[PDB]
Design an enzyme around this catalytic site. Structure first.
Site, PDB file in Angstrom:
ATOM      1  CE  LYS A   1      -3.228   2.976   0.575  1.00 37.58           C
ATOM      2  NZ  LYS A   1      -4.320   3.217  -0.449  1.00 37.58           N
ATOM      3  CB  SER A   2       0.757   4.556  -1.568  1.00 35.22           C
ATOM      4  OG  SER A   2       0.863   4.225  -2.947  1.00 35.22           O
TER       5      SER A   2
ATOM      6  CG  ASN B   1     -10.100   4.489  -4.537  1.00 34.90           C
ATOM      7  OD1 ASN B   1      -9.373   5.191  -3.806  1.00 34.90           O
ATOM      8  ND2 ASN B   1      -9.636   4.136  -5.742  1.00 34.90           N
TER       9      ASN B   1
ATOM     10  CG  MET C   1      -9.035   3.757  -0.813  1.00 35.23           C
ATOM     11  SD  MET C   1     -10.530   2.908  -0.304  1.00 35.23           S
ATOM     12  CE  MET C   1      -9.990   1.960   0.981  1.00 35.23           C
TER      13      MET C   1
ATOM     14  CG  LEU D   1      -1.759   7.914   1.481  1.00 34.51           C
ATOM     15  CD1 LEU D   1      -1.317   6.659   0.617  1.00 34.51           C
ATOM     16  CD2 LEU D   1      -1.152   9.183   0.835  1.00 34.51           C
TER      17      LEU D   1
ATOM     18  CB  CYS E   1      -0.879  14.980  -4.980  1.00 32.13           C
ATOM     19  SG  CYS E   1       0.792  15.079  -5.602  1.00 32.13           S
TER      20      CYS E   1
ATOM     21  CB  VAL F   1      -3.034   4.557 -15.618  1.00 36.32           C
ATOM     22  CG1 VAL F   1      -2.413   4.941 -16.963  1.00 36.32           C
ATOM     23  CG2 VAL F   1      -4.316   3.786 -15.843  1.00 36.32           C
ATOM     24  CG  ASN F   2      -3.041   5.947  -9.151  1.00 30.29           C
ATOM     25  OD1 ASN F   2      -4.115   5.584  -8.661  1.00 30.29           O
ATOM     26  ND2 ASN F   2      -2.005   6.251  -8.402  1.00 30.29           N
ATOM     27  CB  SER F   3      -7.969   5.399  -9.888  1.00 31.83           C
ATOM     28  OG  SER F   3      -7.528   6.232  -8.934  1.00 31.83           O
TER      29      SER F   3
HETATM   30  C1  LIG Z   1      -9.153   0.542  -3.048  1.00 33.17           C
HETATM   31  C2  LIG Z   1      -7.999   1.081  -3.842  1.00 33.17           C
HETATM   32  C3  LIG Z   1      -6.853   1.614  -3.275  1.00 33.17           C
HETATM   33  C4  LIG Z   1      -5.781   2.051  -4.050  1.00 33.17           C
HETATM   34  N1  LIG Z   1      -4.676   2.584  -3.457  1.00 33.17           N
HETATM   35  C5  LIG Z   1      -3.650   2.943  -4.174  1.00 33.17           C
HETATM   36  C6  LIG Z   1      -2.369   3.199  -3.624  1.00 33.17           C
HETATM   37  O1  LIG Z   1      -2.224   3.158  -2.345  1.00 33.17           O
HETATM   38  N2  LIG Z   1      -1.378   3.493  -4.404  1.00 33.17           N
HETATM   39  C7  LIG Z   1      -1.457   3.554  -5.784  1.00 33.17           C
HETATM   40  O2  LIG Z   1      -0.462   3.748  -6.468  1.00 33.17           O
HETATM   41  N3  LIG Z   1      -2.647   3.256  -6.415  1.00 33.17           N
HETATM   42  C8  LIG Z   1      -3.643   2.913  -5.628  1.00 33.17           C
HETATM   43  N4  LIG Z   1      -4.837   2.526  -6.255  1.00 33.17           N
HETATM   44  C9  LIG Z   1      -4.892   2.497  -7.709  1.00 33.17           C
HETATM   45  C10 LIG Z   1      -4.647   1.096  -8.235  1.00 33.17           C
HETATM   46  O3  LIG Z   1      -3.289   0.731  -7.927  1.00 33.17           O
HETATM   47  C11 LIG Z   1      -4.785   1.024  -9.719  1.00 33.17           C
HETATM   48  O4  LIG Z   1      -3.853   1.964 -10.318  1.00 33.17           O
HETATM   49  C12 LIG Z   1      -6.193   1.376 -10.216  1.00 33.17           C
HETATM   50  O5  LIG Z   1      -7.223   0.844  -9.333  1.00 33.17           O
HETATM   51  C13 LIG Z   1      -6.477   0.890 -11.629  1.00 33.17           C
HETATM   52  O6  LIG Z   1      -6.325  -0.509 -11.753  1.00 33.17           O
HETATM   53  P1  LIG Z   1      -7.669  -1.444 -11.846  1.00 33.17           P
HETATM   54  O7  LIG Z   1      -8.432  -1.006 -13.047  1.00 33.17           O
HETATM   55  O8  LIG Z   1      -7.104  -2.820 -11.903  1.00 33.17           O
HETATM   56  O9  LIG Z   1      -8.441  -1.210 -10.551  1.00 33.17           O
HETATM   57  C14 LIG Z   1      -5.906   2.080  -5.479  1.00 33.17           C
HETATM   58  C15 LIG Z   1      -7.053   1.527  -6.028  1.00 33.17           C
HETATM   59  C16 LIG Z   1      -8.072   1.008  -5.248  1.00 33.17           C
HETATM   60  C17 LIG Z   1      -9.304   0.431  -5.955  1.00 33.17           C
HETATM   61  O1  LIG Z   2      -9.272  14.342   2.568  1.00 34.57           O
HETATM   62  C1  LIG Z   2      -9.595  13.758   1.484  1.00 34.57           C
HETATM   63  O2  LIG Z   2     -10.809  13.788   1.103  1.00 34.57           O
HETATM   64  C2  LIG Z   2      -8.610  13.131   0.679  1.00 34.57           C
HETATM   65  C3  LIG Z   2      -9.019  12.505  -0.521  1.00 34.57           C
HETATM   66  C4  LIG Z   2      -8.024  11.893  -1.327  1.00 34.57           C
HETATM   67  C5  LIG Z   2      -6.647  11.930  -0.929  1.00 34.57           C
HETATM   68  C6  LIG Z   2      -5.669  11.306  -1.727  1.00 34.57           C
HETATM   69  C7  LIG Z   2      -4.311  11.310  -1.390  1.00 34.57           C
HETATM   70  C8  LIG Z   2      -3.412  10.675  -2.295  1.00 34.57           C
HETATM   71  C9  LIG Z   2      -3.914   9.188  -2.668  1.00 34.57           C
HETATM   72  C10 LIG Z   2      -2.814   8.306  -2.999  1.00 34.57           C
HETATM   73  C11 LIG Z   2      -3.173   6.802  -2.771  1.00 34.57           C
HETATM   74  C12 LIG Z   2      -4.250   6.358  -3.739  1.00 34.57           C
HETATM   75  C13 LIG Z   2      -5.546   6.087  -3.350  1.00 34.57           C
HETATM   76  C14 LIG Z   2      -6.056   6.355  -2.007  1.00 34.57           C
HETATM   77  O3  LIG Z   2      -5.455   5.862  -1.037  1.00 34.57           O
HETATM   78  O4  LIG Z   2      -7.135   6.996  -1.944  1.00 34.57           O
HETATM   79  N1  LIG Z   2      -6.522   5.730  -4.308  1.00 34.57           N
HETATM   80  C15 LIG Z   2      -6.134   5.518  -5.622  1.00 34.57           C
HETATM   81  O5  LIG Z   2      -7.007   5.163  -6.446  1.00 34.57           O
HETATM   82  N2  LIG Z   2      -4.880   5.824  -5.998  1.00 34.57           N
HETATM   83  C16 LIG Z   2      -3.858   6.179  -5.086  1.00 34.57           C
HETATM   84  O6  LIG Z   2      -2.726   6.388  -5.553  1.00 34.57           O
HETATM   85  C17 LIG Z   2      -3.864  11.953  -0.218  1.00 34.57           C
HETATM   86  C18 LIG Z   2      -4.821  12.566   0.629  1.00 34.57           C
HETATM   87  C19 LIG Z   2      -6.217  12.547   0.278  1.00 34.57           C
HETATM   88  C20 LIG Z   2      -7.223  13.157   1.070  1.00 34.57           C
END
Ligand SMILES: Cc1cc2nc3c(=O)[nH]c(=O)nc-3n(C[C@H](O)[C@H](O)[C@H](O)COP(=O)(O)O)c2cc1C
Ligand SMILES: O=C(O)c1ccc2cc(CCCCc3c(C(=O)O)[nH]c(=O)[nH]c3=O)ccc2c1
Ligand SMILES: Cc1cc2nc3c(=O)[nH]c(=O)nc-3n(C[C@H](O)[C@H](O)[C@H](O)COP(=O)(O)O)c2cc1C
Ligand SMILES: O=C(O)c1ccc2cc(CCCCc3c(C(=O)O)[nH]c(=O)[nH]c3=O)ccc2c1
Ligand SMILES: C[As](C)(=O)[O-]
Ligand SMILES: C[As](C)(=O)[O-]
Ligand SMILES: C[As](C)(=O)[O-]
Ligand SMILES: C[As](C)(=O)[O-]
Lengths: 314, 314
Positions: free
Chosen positions: A45-46, A69, A71, A73, A132, A195-197
């Site tokens: 997890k990041s 999502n 979440m 962080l 971020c 990619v990220n989301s």
């Molecule tokens: C519940 C949840 C938490 C995630 N947390 C992080 C994260 O901590 N760090 C990060 O790089 N991406 C995070 N992501 C993004 C995923 O790593 C991924 O980039 C994204 O969900 C797209 O892939 P998918 O289509 O397989 O879901 C999160 C995604 C989900 C659904």
């Molecule tokens: O206060 C809030 O509403 C809020 C909302 C979103 C926030 C997001 C970040 C950075 C998220 C980085 C970890 C991450 C997440 C996550 O943990 O939400 N989700 C995801 O799809 N990609 C990711 O890379 C850091 C702080 C955040 C604070």
């Protein structure tokens, strides 16, 4: 066909599959479950310097076409993930990646300086998350190209060892060109995870007339089926622009076919987020069997035979 | 007695539905077909000063989850659409919007100077497409806030009458804030249509190992089911940030329920692209019946009873 083992980044992997960061990887239990699975690798997890509770629930929801999502962080803090890497992970089973997402450049530099000796001693691999929180008046770091160039300059200096970078999606060719050029200034950046989301989507339930997550008025990152062509485009755009790097694919993988597409687009590793969250770690045996079946049908014996070999028309 | 009627921009609409620009609206035959349909309005194909053939085929493809295109702005030229507006369209049937997408600010200015008297006399409504490229190697105009401000200043001055703008999706909260602030500098921007296609996706066919469109090495804009949560987010983000403007929703509409979600997010008109391309203009009677059924079930009699009323949690 036969077996999916590959070598990358001075490590050996049984197959190209791993979880996506954030899915099944927050606790020691989760990391042990990923280690026990048939995945080729796992990523943590990041993390941030300090532990975080994250946002109020509900903060994740999934649907037939994917997930949303916000979440916030939630994570156990860097000290925990570092301890996992340095004392608990069984490297004989598979390689480990550690994802870090500090809230400032300084926070990231401080963590990477601590990670470095564990990287050298144990071979844990860094995935730097270049996404971020919202700061009113400021876009996420990978969407501000001079900011991105600064982080990477400082991290490279601080860390001094091969690492990779988790990218948000881009939607504009000029942005592809600019982002890749940034990344290509850094020789230590050995992989790029695309990619990220897809940021700040909005899922609404028609019966209740309500958003489905609590934070940010329902706005959150999208994953799953929604994002597969976006993910493919990013993988291929960076594969083409960063010939001296690896590209790891992430986004919309539910089947061996989806993995096959990511590898055709250029992916070396293939990460599974939403689908893993919804199916559980059993998914990895299914994806390996399905990918091997497609390869067999096509007469491919290796990944290298088709990686990056997507065909264009005329 | 339930009703889909709207009265906005000095016009009366039977229902909120219309085509999305580019779909079923390039030729006189298309326009007459859209007019004959049950839709509440129509919009013409984005035009340029001179006719264009557009990009080589195949340049549009659809799949169960949506579509990809790189049409290349094929159109009959501004004089044709202006003529349609001035001389051919039957305004007794429904309102007409004209979309313009000049390749420079000067081209847009020239077009809106000539449109103005017809807008004043006939009541045709301008939709300015801000996903135009401007300088190649720079991002599309709406992704370059300075360029966007320049286009809006110039067009406002040249045109002098209420108009609207077609926006690409944004994915970062900072961008929603900047983009809306730009728009809110222009009092003549009376509606904002969210969204254009999600840029530069890449669809790959697994059997043939090939991209599915010819231009841009297979990269193209995504529509359809892929994009609904992105569309909703953009509709809601601009609805909240532009309280003195209308928001028109576009993206991912296949059903009355999808339309209901757009409207809960803040949409006034609801535009239909991919689904109309795939199903044809019969879709409008189905969407009206479906929306009305949801409204009946919930006890809503008019669109105003729920437009913008999406609920957040807490
Ligand atoms: C519940 C949840 C938490 C995630 N947390 C992080 C994260 O901590 N760090 C990060 O790089 N991406 C995070 N992501 C993004 C995923 O790593 C991924 O980039 C994204 O969900 C797209 O892939 P998918 O289509 O397989 O879901 C999160 C995604 C989900 C659904
Ligand atoms: O206060 C809030 O509403 C809020 C909302 C979103 C926030 C997001 C970040 C950075 C998220 C980085 C970890 C991450 C997440 C996550 O943990 O939400 N989700 C995801 O799809 N990609 C990711 O890379 C850091 C702080 C955040 C604070
Ligand atoms: C074949 C095709 C042509 C399009 N041409 C234009 C256009 O000329 N002008 C424009 O503003 N949008 C154009 N678009 C984008 C659509 O208006 C719409 O914003 C997008 O397709 C998303 O809506 P959907 O999910 O209903 O397809 C085009 C879309 C398609 C599929
Ligand atoms: O021939 C060229 O050098 C050239 C020049 C300008 C070009 C401009 C565009 C922008 C397309 C605007 C219309 C449009 C299209 C389209 O017609 O491709 N598709 C879509 O999904 N949304 C749209 O808004 C697209 C392609 C272009 C190609
Ligand atoms: C499997 As869990 C609630 O620690 O992501
Ligand atoms: C072109 As072949 C031997 O992978 O079918
Ligand atoms: C219905 As047609 C080819 O003019 O968009
Ligand atoms: C009360 As109002 C729809 O003009 O913001």
């Amino acid at each position: 066909s036969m077996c999916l083992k590959l070598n990358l980044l001075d490590h050996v992997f049984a197959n190209p599959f791993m979880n996506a960061a954030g899915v099944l990887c927050s606790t020691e239990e989760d990391l042990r479950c990923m280690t026990a699975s048939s995945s080729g690798a796992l990523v943590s997890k990041s993390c941030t310097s300090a532990p975080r509770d994250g946002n109020p629930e509900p903060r994740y929801m999934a649907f037939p076409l994917g997930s949303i999502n916000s979440m916030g962080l939630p994570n156990l803090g860097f000290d925990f993930y570092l301890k996992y890497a340095s004392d608990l992970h069984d490297y004989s089973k598979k390689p480990l990646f550690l994802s870090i997402s500090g809230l400032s450049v300084e926070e990231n530099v401080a963590m990477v300086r601590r990670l470095a000796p564990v990287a050298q001693e144990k071979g844990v691999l860094l995935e730097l998350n270049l996404s971020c929180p919202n700061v009113p008046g400021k876009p996420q770091v990978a969407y501000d190209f001079e900011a991105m160039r600064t982080y990477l300059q400082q991290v490279s200096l601080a860390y001094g060892l091969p690492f990779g970078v988790k990218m948000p999606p881009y939607f504009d060719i000029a942005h592809f060109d600019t982002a890749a050029a940034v990344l290509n200034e850094f020789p230590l950046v050995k992989f790029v995870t695309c990619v990220n989301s897809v940021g700040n989507g909005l899922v609404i339930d028609a019966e209740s007339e309500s958003v489905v997550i609590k934070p940010k008025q329902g706005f959150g990152g999208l994953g799953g089926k929604y994002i597969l062509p976006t993910a493919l485009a990013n993988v291929n755009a960076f594969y083409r622009r960063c010939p001296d790097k690896l590209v790891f694919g992430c986004g919309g993988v539910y089947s061996g076919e989806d993995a096959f597409l990511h590898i055709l687009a250029g992916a070396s590793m293939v990460q599974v987020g939403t689908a893993l969250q919804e199916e559980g770690p059993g998914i990895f045996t299914r994806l390996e069997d399905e990918l091997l079946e497609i390869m067999a049908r096509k007469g491919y014996r290796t990944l290298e035979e088709f990686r990056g070999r997507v065909k264009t028309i005329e």
